[PDB]
Amino acid sequence: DRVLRGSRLGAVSYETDRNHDLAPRQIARYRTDNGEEFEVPFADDAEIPGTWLCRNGMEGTLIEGDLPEPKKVKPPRTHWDMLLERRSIEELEELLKERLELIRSRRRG
Amino acid sequence: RVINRNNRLKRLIDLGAPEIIVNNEKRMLQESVDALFDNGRRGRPVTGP
Amino acid sequence: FSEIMRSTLEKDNTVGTDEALLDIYRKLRPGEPPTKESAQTLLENLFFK
Amino acid sequence: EDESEALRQARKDAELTASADSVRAYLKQIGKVALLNAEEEVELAKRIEAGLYATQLMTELSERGEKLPAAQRRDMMWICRDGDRAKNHLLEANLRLVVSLAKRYTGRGMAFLDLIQEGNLGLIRAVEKFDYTKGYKFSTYATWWI
Amino acid sequence: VTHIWYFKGVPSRLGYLLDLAPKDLEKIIYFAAYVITSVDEEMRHNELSTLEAEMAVERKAVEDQRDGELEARAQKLEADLAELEAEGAKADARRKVRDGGEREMRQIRDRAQRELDRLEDIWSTFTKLAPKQLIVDENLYRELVDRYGEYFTGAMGAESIQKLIENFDIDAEAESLRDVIRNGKGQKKLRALKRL
Amino acid sequence: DVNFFDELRIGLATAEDIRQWSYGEVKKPETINYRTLKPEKDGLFCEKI
Structure with missing residues (x-):
């Protein structure tokens, strides 16, 4: 029916491809844990982030030793959490004693 | 398919899974990469709709 | 009368109907544990059921 | 014919085949371990919860804690490993349930082995x-979870 | 994960590089069979004697079980005597229990003989264990690992193939192939060219 | 690729070549947000990567 024609989801602009002056810009250095260095050109008036997902793909921090204490979140839910929220300590300790005397009565008779 | 099977393998190794499930997942990862590089080479060609 | 039929009957190298049925199943279920009730029925499956 | 050795030797030789269908290879893999019953499930679940409480208590007594007795430490690590053995054993036991539930959702959307793994x-x-105490x-x- | 072009397309290149058959390499990289990637030499060279001593201890304990079987069914067979030749009965029905316990010992010595053959097989495999070998039959590999867990490393799949490519001198292997084409003939020389 | 050529040297690639070719690490099986028709982050079409 129609048509065929299609478009990539994005605009194609055309201006002057000038090279003589630009907006001036800095170069920051981020570092992964495993000794990898990466340089990222940020603009001048730009709040440079402390951590940055690098070209390698693992999370990389900045080479300046500030360490802004990101306060990493809790472990989500463990099997200990799903067990503890449906039982109690004296019951689990009772079962622990039962298996303890079970391996005892197995072993030495 | 490759990204799904790789992420599933990564969560299985992180979670702690028995050996059957992990080796099945690695065989699925192998067959996914094999279909990526050459579908229809080894075994049944991966069909679409 | 058939000389080829009596020749292959002498070169049958297997006696026992179920002894032929198991060969049978091995060649047609390569990768399956055989049993007597399966090869009794699976030959009846392909041509008669 | 149970014996003699030929009718089973054919079964053993048919067990070592290629079976390039990974679905059928996985089914031949999971048909090995045997299905269980209710008292066995109670026993397994008690072993699992006991081992989880054991490793929790060992982590608690590890921090700032105890020069443990040798027998008590040795068999509480035995409980810690035995719980994981029971966990993996029950997982292997109910793989076939996983396949029997996921067999009806094929034919659309995804493949079959992806559904099995999920x-x-x-x-x-x-x-x-x-x-288990709900019986x-x-x-x-x-x-439900599957 | 192995690349498919160096594995599947005939002639296989992993196969010629590692001297493996494709029929058996497909069992490795598709997780169907184990492969031995390393083995200790001198530890096998002296604990071979210590473990064949342990094997003799184990098979003697097996025979302790087996003459327990012999003695127990001997006692039950003299009970068959004392309850078959001590009453009024038929001459063949008094010895159907004689044939019963003897058939029991025949199938029981078949049980003990087959498991002793299993132990003999696993001992022969641990003696002739070598890298680039394939241990099919999962049960044998599991028993072999958890009784002889030192002395060798052996894995399954593409990481094991990677480990083999790590532990592979190409130079001495190449010069061995140069020596085979220097001296060999026939099928060996043709395969030596096709791997060289 | 200005038109100055003397050779074209193929070679079997290594992993240190592959993760040096790349500009990112795709790690999600997503392409395009269904509602805004813009590419996902860390997907198969991410503008960062």
Whole structure:
């Protein structure tokens, strides 16, 4: 029916491809844990982030030793959490004693 | 398919899974990469709709 | 009368109907544990059921 | 004919085949370990919860804690490993339940082995959050998570 | 994960590089069979004697079980005597229990003989264990690992193939192939060219 | 690729070549947000990568 024609989801602009002056810009250095260095050109008036997902793909921090204490979140839910929220300590300790005397009565008779 | 099977393998190794499930997942990862590089080479060609 | 039929009957190298049925199943279920009730029925499956 | 050795030797030689269908290879893999019953499930779940309490208590007494007795430390690590053995054993036991539930969702959307593996991950979640004191067969509670 | 072009397309290149058959390499990289990637030499060279001593201890304990079987069914067979030749009965029905316990010992010595053959097989495999070998039959590999867990490393799949490519001198292997084409003949020389 | 050529040297690539070719690490099986029709982050079409 129609048509065929299609478009990539994005605009194609055309201006002057000038090279003589630009907006001036800095170069920051981020570092992964495993000794990898990466340089990222940020603009001048730009709040440079402390951590940055690098070209390698693992999370990389900045080479300046500030360490802004990101306060990493809790472990989500463990099997200990799903067990503890449906039982109690004296019951689990009772079962622990039962298996303890079970391996005892197995072993030495 | 490759990204799904790789992420599933990564969560299985992180979670702690028995050996059957992990080796099945690695065989699925192998067959996914094999279909990526050459579908229809080894075994049944991966069909679409 | 058939000389080829009596020749292959002498070169049958297997006696026992179920002894032929198991060969049978091995060649047609390569990768399956055989049993007597399966090869009794699976030959009846392909041509008669 | 149970014996003699030929009718079983054919079975053993048919067990070592290629079977390039990974689906059929996985089914031949999971048909090995045997299906269980209710008292066995109670025993397994008690072993699992005991081992989880054992490793929690060992982590608690490890921090700032105890020069443990040798017997008590040795067999509480025995409990810690035996719980994981019981966990993996129950997972292997109910793999076939996973396949029997995921067999009806094929034919659309995804492949078959992806559905099997996602059912397996749900089965891991179910064996984590299974309770036995309500006194039910395991398949009833695990079917929801699968 | 192995690349498919160096594995599947005939002639296989992993196969010629590692001297493996494709029929058996497909069992490795598709997780169907184990492969031995390393083995200790001198530890096998002296604990071979210590473990064949342990094997003799184990098979003697097996025979302790087996003459327990012999003695127990001997006592039950003299009970068959004392309850078959001590009453009024038929001459063949008094010895159907004689044939019963003897058939029991025949199938029981078949049980003990087959498991002793299993132990003999696993001992022969641990003696002739070498890298680039394939241990099919999962049960044998599991028993072999958890009784002889030192002395070798052996894995399954593409990481094991990677480990083999790590532990592979190409130079001495190449010069061995140069020596085979220097001296060999026939099928060996043709395969030596096709791998060289 | 200005038109100055003397050779074209193929070679079997290594992993240190592959993760040096790349500009990112795709790690999600997503392409395009269904509602805004813009590419996902860390997907198969991410503008960062």
